[PDB]
Amino acid sequence: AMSMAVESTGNAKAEAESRAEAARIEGEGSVLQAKLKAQALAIETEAELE
Amino acid sequence: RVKKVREMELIYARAQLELEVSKAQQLANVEAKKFKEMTEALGPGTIRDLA
């Protein structure tokens, strides 16, 4: 029974942590994607302002 | 962005709406003076008598 416990832990644990630690990547993607679009859109808008 | 597009909008909006009121002033000055020349040489009592 504590065997089947360890397989269940490993399976659900592995799947969930894979999803969350990938969401870490989409998160840092959001971080520096916001940082880049900040100045990018900034220069389009300040070029269309004049 | 939402500050500096929308504030240059405020400043141009001023430059245009003191403008429309300036248009209104000048056209209404001409309407004014040319009703004045109208009535004063038509006659102060003539307008009363005709009505």
Curated annotation (Swiss-Prot), chain B:
The chain holds residues 761 to 811 of 861 of the full protein. Phosphorylated on Tyr residues after EGF stimulation. Dephosphorylated by PTPN11. It comes from the Eukaryota. The vault ribonucleoprotein particle is a huge (400 A x 670 A) cage structure of 12.9 MDa. It consists of a dimer of half-vaults, with each half-vault comprising 39 identical major vault protein (MVP) chains, PARP4 and one or more vault RNAs (vRNAs). Interacts with TEP1. Interacts with PTEN and activated MAPK1. The phosphorylated protein interacts with the SH2 domains of PTPN11 and SRC. Interacts with APEX1. May interact with ZNF540. It is found in: Cytoplasm; Nucleus. Required for normal vault structure. Vaults are multi-subunit structures that may act as scaffolds for proteins involved in signal transduction. Vaults may also play a role in nucleo-cytoplasmic transport. Down-regulates IFNG-mediated STAT1 signaling and subsequent activation of JAK. Down-regulates SRC activity and signaling through MAP kinases. This is Major vault protein. It comes from Rattus norvegicus (Rat). MVP 3 mediates interaction with PTEN. MVP 4 mediates interaction with PARP4.
